[PDB]
Symmetry: C2
Subunit: 526 residues, 2 copies
C-alpha cells in the first residue's frame, strides 16, 4: 500500500521546508507529523539564496513572492561579490587595489548570451588573449557589475524586473513562516518533544521513535531533519558520514548580526564573500542590518584567532559582541536515504555557504524525494536513484567550491598555500582540462532565462554551467591556454560579436542612469 | 596554427555529408578534398530518418526541406510500425491476430503529454493495471496510431503540419544531391581515385595518402568515411574495432527495391519493422517503390535461408530478383578519433537500422566534431571528449535496440530464444529497473516539441527519452511491476487525466476525418 504516515524529526529550516513541500505534494493522502525540541536559539546571521527558490519552492507551495518576503523582512540578491581573493593581506571589508581597480569580481545570475552558437565567454577570451581588450570577464559579458557597483535595485519603481535576482533573509523568520503555513494550511501535526529512542525492526527499517515524555511515533517513512547530529540517518541507521576535508579545509564559523543604517548608506543588492587570512567572510545585507560570518579552517586558525580577526574587521568588541561560534560537519552521508529513512538538510550534507546552496539543497532533495516517492514496499531502485541524484548535487558543489580556493593566486598565508596542495577530484580535473582547451563546461542547452530558472529538472541537470565556471575561474584569473580553435574558422562571427559587447555596454549605461537604488525600492514597498 | 586542409576518404552517404557539413562550417577557412573510388554500386534499398535531419543537418547547410525532398524523391515517415514481434510464426508481411486485433504497435515521433508534471504513460499504466482500460499504450497516448492506420498525411493539403515526421528516401540520391552541393557551392574538391598507401609519421599520425594513380595527398586532418573497411582508422592507424555481437545477434542483410502501385494502395507514412524467424525486415515506402531488407543473424540462418524467406515474404523470385547480400560489422571503434584521424559513418560504428539511426550517427558526429574542433596541435582533451560523446551515443542506441529483442515474448525459433540468453549492459539493466519501479526514464525536461527537435544539444543529451522507452517496452508487453507510487497521492490528477485521454481521442477522430491520404499529399 501507499505510505500513510510520515514523521519528520527536526524543526528549523529544513524541517519546516520538508513539512511544507511534503504537505503540499501529498496533500490529503498522508498524515504528517514533525517532532521539534527547543534548542538554544542563535543570532539570525543571514541566508543567501538562488532564484529558483521562488520557482521550485514557494510557487510549488502556492506562495507569492510578495507574501513571504514581507513576513520575512527580505532583501534582494543580484550576485555574489568576491572581494580580495587575488591579493595578499589581512582580512578587511575594503577591497584592495589590483591592476588599477578594486580587487573584486562578481558571480551574477545573468544569462551568458550565445553569438552564433558559442557563449560570449569564448569571444571575450579570444579578444583578451590577443590584447584587443583588458576588460575583466564579468564587466564585458554581463550588464550586472556596473549597476551593482552603484547599488541599483533589480526592479524599477513601477515593479518591472530588469535582472535575475534572489533573496537575503534571516532563516529563522522563514522557518517560522513555513511552520505557520504547514500547521495552519496543510494540517501538519507539530509535536514539541525530544527523541529518546529509535526502534528498528529486523530489516533495519525504523519502526518508531520514542520521545522523552514516553510517546511513541510510528510511521511508514521517516525524514531526518535533525541537522549535524543525524539522529536517525547516523545514530539510528548507522550510515557513515563522508568527511570531505581532503577537498574542503573550512569547517568552522564565527558569526553575528550588525545593525545598519540604510538611510545613510543604502543597501547592497549582493552577498559579499570577503577573502580572509584563513577562510572567508560572508556579508548578507538585510533590512536595517547585515548578517556576517567568518568561515575558517580550524586547521589554520584557533577559535580565538578567528574571533579576533572577524571582530577587528567589523570594529566590534570581541569581549561583548553577541557571537555564534559554530563547528560545521562538512561532507555528506555515504547514502542520503537508507531503508525508510531519508535525510534532508545538513543531516544529509553540508558545504560552507560560499555559493548560497544550503536552502537549495533542501528543496532540490525534496523535489527528488517526491520524484522518487516510494510506497510501503520501498522499491530499492527508487532509493538508489535518489541517492545518486543527491551524491552528484553535493559532489559537483563540493568541486566547484574547492576551485574557488585552489585557483586563488594567493600564497600569503599557510591556509592559501595549503589549498594549492590539495587534489581536485577526477571529475573536476576533467572540467578544468576542458576549460583550458577552450570548451564550454556544461553549456546551458538554452540561453533563455525563464526556461532555465523556471524549469527545475533542466536546472537541476545543468546546475553549474559554463557561465558559473567562467565567472569564478576567469574571476580568479584562470583562463584557457588558447582561444577556442573554432573561432579562427568563424571570421564573420568574430567581427559581428562587437555589437553584442556593445549591447551590453548600452544596457550597462542605460540601467545605471534609470534604475533607482535598492534602498529606494525597498522603502516604496515598506 | 588552424587546420588549413582536410582530406575526406570515401564518398558515399557519410563522405558527402561530411564534405557538406565541414565545407559549410569552415567555409573559406579550410581546403577540403574528398577521395572516392569507383565501386560496384548497390541497389537503393531505402533509408529512414528522424526529424532532426532537417533541423540539425539541412538547416545548418541552409537547404530548405522542399529543395532536397523533391530532388531525392523522398516520402514521409511518422513512425515505425512493429509487426509480429509478439506472435509465433513465419516471416509474413501481414500482421497475425493477437488478443482480438493485429499484432502491431507504433513507435511515433509524437510527444507524450505531461499531466501535473507526470508523463501520460504513467496514468495510462495505472489505469491499465487497475483494469480501467484494455487499450494499448500507443492508441491511448498518441493521436498518431489511428491516422497511421488509414495512411494519412502528416500535412494538410494547405501545408500545415499536424504531427512530427521524418523522411524515407534512397540514400544514393541524397548523396548525389550532397555531392553537387559540396562541389558546386562549397568548393570541395572531388578526386576519383583509390587509396594505395597511407604514410604515417613518428607520432603515428597520418602524414599522407598516396593513390593508385601515384597522387599524394597531405592534410592537417583526415576524415575516414571509407565504410566498414576503415582504411584510415582501423587499417592505417590500427585502432581496434569493438564487436558488440554479445548484445546484438544481427550481422547480415538481404535487401532489395520493390515496385509499388501507389494509385491502388496508397503510401504508408511509416517504416515497417517486420519480425522474422531469425531477425526482422524493414519496409521503407518511397515514391512508386519500397525499399526492403531482411536483417538477420548469420548464426541462426544461412544466406540461402534468409534469401528464400525474404523472397517468399514479398512474393519475389529468388533467381531473378536483384538482391544485395551484405555482411555488417556490428559495434564501434575503441576510439572514433585517433591522432589526426576522425572516423565518421560506418567506418566508426554500426548497428542495424531498427530505429533509423544511421544518418543520425553521421550528422550527430559531425556536430560533435565541429564542437570539439582542434587546431594543428590536436589538443588531446578535445579528442577524448569527442570520443566520449560518440561512445555514449552509440552504446545507448545499442542498448535500446537490444531491448527490442530481449523483451519480445517470442520463443518459437532458436533466434528469439537466444536473444533472451544475452545480458543487458549495466546501464540498460538500471533503466529497466527504473522502468519497472514506475519511473520515467530520461523524461524530456520539456513537454515542448520545437525546443526538443529544434535544439540539437538538447536532443543529443536526451536522445532516448521516456516516450521512446514506453513505446517499445509497453509495445512489446513489458510494463512496470505496479503503478507509480506518486499517483496514489494525486487523486485530483488521476481524476482530471480523463480529459487528456479524451483530447487525444478527439484529435484521433478529427484528423482521421479531415486529413488527406499521404498519397494525396505527395501527388501535390
Amino acid at each position: 500500500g501507499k505510505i500513510d504516515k510520515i514523521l519528520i524529526v527536526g524543526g528549523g529550516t529544513a524541517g519546516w521546508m520538508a513539512a511544507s513541500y511534503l504537505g503540499k505534494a501529498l496533500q490529503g493522502t498522508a498524515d504528517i507529523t514533525l517532532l521539534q525540541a527547543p534548542d538554544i536559539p542563535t543570532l539570525g546571521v543571514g541566508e543567501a539564496t538562488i532564484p529558483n527558490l521562488q520557482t521550485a519552492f514557494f510557487d510549488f507551495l502556492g506562495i507569492p513572492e510578495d507574501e513571504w518576503m514581507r513576513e520575512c523582512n527580505a532583501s534582494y540578491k543580484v550576485a555574489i561579490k568576491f572581494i580580495n581573493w587575488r591579493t595578499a593581506g589581512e582580512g578587511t571589508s575594503e577591497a584592495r587595489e589590483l591592476d588599477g581597480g578594486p580587487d573584486h569580481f562578481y558571480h551574477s545570475f545573468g544569462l551568458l548570451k550565445y553569438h552564433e552558437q558559442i557563449p560570449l565567454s569564448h569571444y571575450w577570451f579570444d579578444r583578451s588573449y590577443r590584447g584587443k581588450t583588458v576588460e575583466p570577464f564579468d564587466y564585458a559579458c554581463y550588464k550586472e557589475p556596473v549597476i551593482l557597483d552603484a547599488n541599483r535595485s533589480p526592479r524599477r519603481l513601477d515593479g518591472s524586473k530588469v535582472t535575475n535576482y534572489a533573496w537575503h533573509f534571516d532563516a529563522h523568520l522563514v522557518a517560522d513562516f513555513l511552520r505557520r503555513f504547514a500547521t495552519e494550511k496543510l494540517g501538519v501535526r507539530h509535536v514539541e518533544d525530544r527523541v529518546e529512542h529509535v526502534q528498528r525492526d529486523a530489516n533495519g527499517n525504523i519502526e518508531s521513535v520514542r520521545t522523552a515524555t514516553g510517546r511513541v511515533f510510528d510511521a511508514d517513512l521517516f525524514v531526518d531533519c535533525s541537522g549535524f547530529r543525524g539522529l536517525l540517518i547516523n545514530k539510528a541507521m548507522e550510515e557513515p558520514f563522508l568527511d570531505m576535508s581532503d577537498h574542503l579545509l573550512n569547517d568552522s564559523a564565527v558569526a553575528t548580526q550588525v545593525p545598519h543604517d540604510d538611510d545613510a548608506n543604502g543597501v547592497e543588492p549582493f552577498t559579499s564573500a570577503i577573502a580572509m587570512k584563513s577562510g572567508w567572510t560572508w556579508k548578507i545585507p538585510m533590512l536595517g542590518r547585515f548578517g556576517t560570518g567568518y568561515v575558517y579552517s580550524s586547521r589554520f586558525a584557533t577559535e580565538d584567532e578567528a574571533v579576533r580577526e572577524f571582530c577587528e574587521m567589523w570594529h566590534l568588541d570581541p569581549e561583548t559582541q553577541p557571537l555564534n561560534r559554530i563547528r560545521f560537519r562538512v561532507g555528506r552521508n555515504r547514502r542520503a536515504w537508507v531503508g525508510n529513512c531519508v535525510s534532508i538538510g545538513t543531516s544529509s550534507c553540508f558545504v560552507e555557504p560560499l555559493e548560497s546552496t544550503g536552502i537549495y539543497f533542501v528543496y532540490a532533495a525534496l523535489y527528488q524525494l517526491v520524484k522518487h516517492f516510494p510506497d510501503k514496499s520501498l522499491n530499492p531502485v527508487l532509493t538508489a536513484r535518489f541517492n545518486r541524484e543527491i551524491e552528484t548535487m553535493f559532489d559537483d558543489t563540493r568541486d566547484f567550491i574547492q576551485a574557488h580556493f585552489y585557483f586563488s593566486p594567493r600564497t600569503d598565508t599557510p591556509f592559501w598555500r595549503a589549498n594549492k596542495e590539495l587534489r581536485l577530484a577526477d571529475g573536476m580535473q576533467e572540467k578544468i582540462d576542458m576549460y583550458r582547451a577552450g570548451m564550454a563546461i556544461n553549456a546551458p542547452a538554452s540561453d533563455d532565462a525563464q526556461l532555465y530558472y523556471g524549469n527545475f529538472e533542466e536546472e537541476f541537470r545543468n546546475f553549474w554551467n559554463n557561465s558559473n565556471y567562467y565567472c569564478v575561474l576567469a574571476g580568479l584569473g584562470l583562463v584557457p591556454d588558447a582561444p577556442s580553435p573554432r573561432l579562427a574558422h568563424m571570421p564573420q562571427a568574430t567581427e559581428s560579436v562587437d555589437e553584442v559587447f556593445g549591447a551590453v555596454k548600452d544596457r550597462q549605461r542605460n540601467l545605471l542612469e534609470t534604475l533607482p537604488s535598492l534602498h529606494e525600492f525597498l522603502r516604496q514597498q515598506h
